[PDB]
Amino acid sequence: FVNQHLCGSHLVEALYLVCGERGFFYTP
């Protein structure tokens, strides 16, 4: 699961940027 774990760190950073003030709901 190491690769999926590294990708998710990147994913939440993108979501943070894309979603701006609305924020977001993260599930793996």
Add this chain to the structure above:
Amino acid sequence: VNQHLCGSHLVEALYLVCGERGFFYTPK
């Protein structure tokens, strides 16, 4: 501009702390 910058670190921490559960993020 620290608000924007601190959010990016907070979502990484949340990602790491919450693991497979995920989390729900909003500013404000």
Add this chain to the structure above:
Amino acid sequence: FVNQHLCGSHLVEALYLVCGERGFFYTP
């Protein structure tokens, strides 16, 4: 300059995402 240095790290990450395949030209 410490704050501007920290912000720029964040900025190049956003640019990387925003610019996709086109890439980008960064100057402080």
Add this chain to the structure above:
Amino acid sequence: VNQHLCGSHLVEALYLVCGERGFFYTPK
């Protein structure tokens, strides 16, 4: 998906290595 992920680390490194000069980034 490592290509996308590796680019994000590469631009941070470039940011740090290039300093006030900036850099020019493209994939491919």
Add this chain to the structure above:
Amino acid sequence: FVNQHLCGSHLVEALYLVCGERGFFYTPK
């Protein structure tokens, strides 16, 4: 395949969060 160099950067970030002020003695790639 895992890029160990890149994985290492994430592991050091995780260690920084986990260990706080007392720091870490080894990066377990």
Add this chain to the structure above:
Amino acid sequence: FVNQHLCGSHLVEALYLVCGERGFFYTPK
């Protein structure tokens, strides 16, 4: 004002890049 906690995370990333495999002994916040 500099958030030392947050600055620390960047410094550890910089140290990881600079020191590579031999690692670092102190995080100079």
Add this chain to the structure above:
Amino acid sequence: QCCTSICSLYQLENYCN
């Protein structure tokens, strides 16, 4: 799902609140 294939800005929009 965004770790098998890469997601665009538009696919990423779907996680937002």
Add this chain to the structure above:
Amino acid sequence: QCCTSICSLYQLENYCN
């Protein structure tokens, strides 16, 4: 409450699903 102080990993657990 976390940008202006270091929240405990205990406290951050409040954001988890």
Add this chain to the structure above:
Amino acid sequence: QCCTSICSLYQLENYCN
């Protein structure tokens, strides 16, 4: 300029090649 005030996606577009 993006470290004095925050830049939107649209202001960030201007750095792209």
Add this chain to the structure above:
Amino acid sequence: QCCTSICSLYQLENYCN
């Protein structure tokens, strides 16, 4: 270990000074 098999945060605590 941790770049071949995923390590939880509890696991990483064993590398703190």
Add this chain to the structure above:
Amino acid sequence: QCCTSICSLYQLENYCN
């Protein structure tokens, strides 16, 4: 040439302006 190997800081200097 840098995703599939660790480039030297010497080599990365090639991307600088």
Add this chain to the structure above:
Amino acid sequence: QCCTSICSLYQLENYCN
């Protein structure tokens, strides 16, 4: 030092093992 005054990469080399 480095979170009050900016440290160059050459400077950070002094903290490597």
